[PDB]
Amino acid sequence: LENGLARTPPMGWLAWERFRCNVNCREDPRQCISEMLFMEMADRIAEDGWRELGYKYINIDDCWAAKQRDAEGRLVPDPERFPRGIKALADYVHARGLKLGIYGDLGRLTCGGYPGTTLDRVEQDAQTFAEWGVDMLKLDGCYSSGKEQAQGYPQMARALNATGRPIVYSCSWPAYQGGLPPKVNYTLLGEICNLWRNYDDIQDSWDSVLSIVDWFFTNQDVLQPFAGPGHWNDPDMLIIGNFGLSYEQSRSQMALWTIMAAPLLMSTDLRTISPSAKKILQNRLMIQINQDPLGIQGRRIIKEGSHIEVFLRPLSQAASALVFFSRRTDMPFRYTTSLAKLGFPMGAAYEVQDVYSGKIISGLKTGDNFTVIINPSGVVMWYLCPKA
Amino acid sequence: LENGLARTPPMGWLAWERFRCNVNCREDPRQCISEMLFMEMADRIAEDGWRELGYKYINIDDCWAAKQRDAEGRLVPDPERFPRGIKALADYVHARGLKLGIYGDLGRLTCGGYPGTTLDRVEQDAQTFAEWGVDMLKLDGCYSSGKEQAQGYPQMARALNATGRPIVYSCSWPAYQGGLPPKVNYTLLGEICNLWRNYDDIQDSWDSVLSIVDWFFTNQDVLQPFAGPGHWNDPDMLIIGNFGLSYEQSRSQMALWTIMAAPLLMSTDLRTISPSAKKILQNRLMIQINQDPLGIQGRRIIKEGSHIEVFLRPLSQAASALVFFSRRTDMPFRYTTSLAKLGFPMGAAYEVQDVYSGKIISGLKTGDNFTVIINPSGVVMWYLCPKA
Ligand SMILES: *[C@@H]1O[C@H](CO)[C@@H](O[C@@H]2O[C@H](CO)[C@@H](O)[C@H](O)[C@H]2NC(C)=O)[C@H](O)[C@H]1NC(C)=O
Ligand SMILES: *[C@@H]1O[C@H](CO)[C@@H](O[C@@H]2O[C@H](CO)[C@@H](O)[C@H](O)[C@H]2NC(C)=O)[C@H](O)[C@H]1NC(C)=O
Ligand SMILES: *[C@@H]1O[C@H](CO)[C@@H](O)[C@H](O)[C@H]1NC(C)=O
Ligand SMILES: *[C@@H]1O[C@H](CO)[C@@H](O)[C@H](O)[C@H]1NC(C)=O
Ligand SMILES: *[C@@H]1O[C@H](CO)[C@@H](O)[C@H](O)[C@H]1NC(C)=O
Ligand SMILES: *[C@@H]1O[C@H](CO)[C@@H](O)[C@H](O)[C@H]1NC(C)=O
């Protein structure tokens, strides 16, 4: 989508995976979906170093609105959970130099049972969001037919533009259509959306992450070519800092999402996040690679019988990123190979930096053998710069 | 096995899951299988509070011996990796008030390819171990037929007794025979072994833990009745502190192994263990319940459609232990029920202590509703004492 936005994958926080549709603010004041949740996450992003790293979006997902539109047919937030309205929430977020994202559903109802954005409501809702000061909109696709979606998604892109307010547009259209051609036309998506959820919702477990990793890389031929500045593939939220991932697994999701040029939308409680989880999510070099200006999504290039997978992502400044991933469940594994074997130019030399450890290799020749030790369900990630 | 040993499930450290058959001491001085590994783990157990809690066994697993017996036909440790011999290692461990465990295989070769204990070598090997000062022996079953195992396992029990040295005897016999009757006779196992590996080796992943949990509880009817002081079911090593389990998952394995009256044999690097992992493994109340004098293995009593499972273990002093386990992957879950609904006596009251948080409920009436909040892949564990 050529609206000057999302020239790099969106970075921020999104409520859904961690907080879901919790409306029990009486017993879960901090974990329930309310204006307070977003204001506090905004303070967290603004105060704990996240903002400086690039994390700027504070996104509201499903279950924020009243169970019905007002009499005028407009969407309104839940009165008890959002007593100051959305515009006020936006100002608050804006005052911190952050941006506010909201959620809607092209259809009769949101997946959670809240007011849906039917075709006759698209222009009005887009208008309502802009007036509130919204900066990003995720448009879900429950309760709408393929025909209605084919009309509605492009229609909402036009409506958003008409408001004159630049709004990042996240589309779930592909996921509802199976995520693959011919049913999905990624060329069209690139023209109308800034990013799109291609596949299943991420759940809080390592198997969920693996399921997403495997679907995207198995189908990379029909997905990788359509990602770029202004239009990204979205494998869903980062679940680092939550309940299901071990330390190694958390490092793995961050690394693989970076290879995929995926949005870095955290869905975790920033008020209780652990130091190790924070350290992973705040890795500057990792973020630099994810945010690379060229926006060329990487690919899996090797699947060893040793249960080791290798990924490569081409970058700006003639650089590259490599991820060595172990799916073994026995012990740290010694993977030995050479850049030449991985496909790099002959007779060259590279300065290599281990993204997580910081260790550097001054001048690795492409013909030289090297060994990396990868832990179970973990990765070793390299940033490579050619010497001249 | 009535040898006065293992009146409570064995507690200690075992090398296998974490260190496997690593013999590359040149590049992995600390992680390779050598006398140094065991001496250092012994120091760890003796110095970091483990010994006082009950952890006393330091067990050597596969890959410790020389590739062949000496000329006299006796087992000898690998010369380079165990330069001071086993007896010296035992003395060292003994000097710390700990006990040394060793590994052998009833068959032509150990699963790792090392010298096996064939039938004609049983008496000699049992003799060799006693002389070295061995306190525990795990007898694996690779490369032996069912007929040979039927003869060898009972035969080794007799050989060990004859040495006059009390030795905990861990038998893998059942695992090689499928772990279920009629092929396996757990009454016989109780007579000849102190504990036995019934099922597959644990690997470093949550799915491995779940696979073990599900097999044992699905088949609890033919397993639970045969566990007791002196003879236990062994679901394998604790992998808390390693690469594949998240925090919640680690707490879950500890709790479920305690419900199963399982040995608490840690297989992790005690030199680098995290504070949180240490805190889980050192939980005194948890250990007290695992070590309960009655030795009555618990059972799964409920499998909700909410993906919540409930476990109960009867204890001494008319007490009980309950585990509420969530296999959901969405968010913290509120499980509401009553002790009456769980099956407890009518019109009674209990003092309840949350094993992990320490929070206490003074006098919970069996008829009163209560709610516990369980995190994804996590547990809530209670210790209950009746009031009078
Ligand atoms: C509506 O669409 C127009 C283009 O159709 C957007 O204008 C483009 O903005 C980008 C970045 O600001 C420029 O690089 C292009 O040159 C512009 N194109 C044209 C035709 O001028 C405009 O930003 C959109 N409006 C909103 C609010 O999204
Ligand atoms: C060999 O077996 C005998 C029993 O057959 C063991 O002796 C028993 O030891 C326990 C605990 O010390 C006592 O409760 C029993 O009363 C003993 N039984 C008998 C018949 O005396 C003996 O400990 C075993 N020897 C070894 C080295 O394991
Ligand atoms: C996909 O959409 C683009 C953009 O509208 C269009 O040019 C192209 O023809 C479509 N492809 C197919 C197979 O319909
Ligand atoms: C490099 O390592 C590979 C093992 O992956 C080996 O086959 C090859 O012979 C090595 N090359 C040299 C020059 O040692
Ligand atoms: C199981 O072993 C015990 C102990 O030797 C024996 O008494 C019993 O008969 C055996 N059960 C069967 C079915 O063979
Ligand atoms: C106790 O909670 C259950 C829900 O599990 C509910 O059905 C029941 O009515 C409650 N009992 C009382 C007295 O509130």
mmCIF file with all atom_site columns, C-alpha atoms and ligand atoms in Angstrom, chain A residues 2-4 160-161 164-166, ligand 1:
data_model
loop_
_atom_site.group_PDB
_atom_site.id
_atom_site.type_symbol
_atom_site.label_atom_id
_atom_site.label_alt_id
_atom_site.label_comp_id
_atom_site.label_asym_id
_atom_site.label_entity_id
_atom_site.label_seq_id
_atom_site.pdbx_PDB_ins_code
_atom_site.Cartn_x
_atom_site.Cartn_y
_atom_site.Cartn_z
_atom_site.occupancy
_atom_site.B_iso_or_equiv
_atom_site.pdbx_formal_charge
_atom_site.auth_seq_id
_atom_site.auth_comp_id
_atom_site.auth_asym_id
_atom_site.auth_atom_id
_atom_site.pdbx_PDB_model_num
ATOM   1  C CA  . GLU A 1 2   ? 1.597  3.249  -1.161 1.00 0.00 ? 2   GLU A CA  1
ATOM   2  C CA  . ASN A 1 3   ? 0.551  5.515  1.713  1.00 0.00 ? 3   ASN A CA  1
ATOM   3  C CA  . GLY A 1 4   ? 4.098  6.282  2.808  1.00 0.00 ? 4   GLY A CA  1
ATOM   4  C CA  . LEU A 1 160 ? -9.033 5.180  4.952  1.00 0.00 ? 160 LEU A CA  1
ATOM   5  C CA  . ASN A 1 161 ? -7.260 7.241  2.302  1.00 0.00 ? 161 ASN A CA  1
ATOM   6  C CA  . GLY A 1 164 ? -6.789 12.160 4.736  1.00 0.00 ? 164 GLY A CA  1
ATOM   7  C CA  . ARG A 1 165 ? -5.211 10.604 7.815  1.00 0.00 ? 165 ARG A CA  1
ATOM   8  C CA  . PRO A 1 166 ? -2.300 8.211  7.203  1.00 0.00 ? 166 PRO A CA  1
HETATM 9  C C1  . LIG C 2 .   ? -3.897 8.257  -0.670 1.00 0.00 ? 1   LIG C C1  1
HETATM 10 O O1  . LIG C 2 .   ? -3.223 7.715  -1.812 1.00 0.00 ? 1   LIG C O1  1
HETATM 11 C C2  . LIG C 2 .   ? -2.204 8.592  -2.331 1.00 0.00 ? 1   LIG C C2  1
HETATM 12 C C3  . LIG C 2 .   ? -1.692 7.964  -3.610 1.00 0.00 ? 1   LIG C C3  1
HETATM 13 O O2  . LIG C 2 .   ? -2.761 7.434  -4.379 1.00 0.00 ? 1   LIG C O2  1
HETATM 14 C C4  . LIG C 2 .   ? -1.109 8.791  -1.286 1.00 0.00 ? 1   LIG C C4  1
HETATM 15 O O3  . LIG C 2 .   ? -0.102 9.679  -1.801 1.00 0.00 ? 1   LIG C O3  1
HETATM 16 C C5  . LIG C 2 .   ? 1.157  9.130  -1.982 1.00 0.00 ? 1   LIG C C5  1
HETATM 17 O O4  . LIG C 2 .   ? 1.907  9.330  -0.776 1.00 0.00 ? 1   LIG C O4  1
HETATM 18 C C6  . LIG C 2 .   ? 3.226  8.746  -0.843 1.00 0.00 ? 1   LIG C C6  1
HETATM 19 C C7  . LIG C 2 .   ? 3.865  8.933  0.519  1.00 0.00 ? 1   LIG C C7  1
HETATM 20 O O5  . LIG C 2 .   ? 3.391  10.113 1.151  1.00 0.00 ? 1   LIG C O5  1
HETATM 21 C C8  . LIG C 2 .   ? 4.040  9.406  -1.964 1.00 0.00 ? 1   LIG C C8  1
HETATM 22 O O6  . LIG C 2 .   ? 5.302  8.761  -2.079 1.00 0.00 ? 1   LIG C O6  1
HETATM 23 C C9  . LIG C 2 .   ? 3.294  9.310  -3.298 1.00 0.00 ? 1   LIG C C9  1
HETATM 24 O O7  . LIG C 2 .   ? 3.975  10.080 -4.277 1.00 0.00 ? 1   LIG C O7  1
HETATM 25 C C10 . LIG C 2 .   ? 1.852  9.816  -3.162 1.00 0.00 ? 1   LIG C C10 1
HETATM 26 N N1  . LIG C 2 .   ? 1.125  9.536  -4.387 1.00 0.00 ? 1   LIG C N1  1
HETATM 27 C C11 . LIG C 2 .   ? 0.448  10.500 -5.004 1.00 0.00 ? 1   LIG C C11 1
HETATM 28 C C12 . LIG C 2 .   ? -0.431 10.085 -6.172 1.00 0.00 ? 1   LIG C C12 1
HETATM 29 O O8  . LIG C 2 .   ? 0.506  11.686 -4.669 1.00 0.00 ? 1   LIG C O8  1
HETATM 30 C C13 . LIG C 2 .   ? -1.718 9.380  -0.014 1.00 0.00 ? 1   LIG C C13 1
HETATM 31 O O9  . LIG C 2 .   ? -0.726 9.439  1.003  1.00 0.00 ? 1   LIG C O9  1
HETATM 32 C C14 . LIG C 2 .   ? -2.898 8.530  0.469  1.00 0.00 ? 1   LIG C C14 1
HETATM 33 N N2  . LIG C 2 .   ? -3.567 9.218  1.554  1.00 0.00 ? 1   LIG C N2  1
HETATM 34 C C15 . LIG C 2 .   ? -3.650 8.650  2.754  1.00 0.00 ? 1   LIG C C15 1
HETATM 35 C C16 . LIG C 2 .   ? -4.233 9.490  3.877  1.00 0.00 ? 1   LIG C C16 1
HETATM 36 O O10 . LIG C 2 .   ? -3.282 7.496  2.978  1.00 0.00 ? 1   LIG C O10 1
#
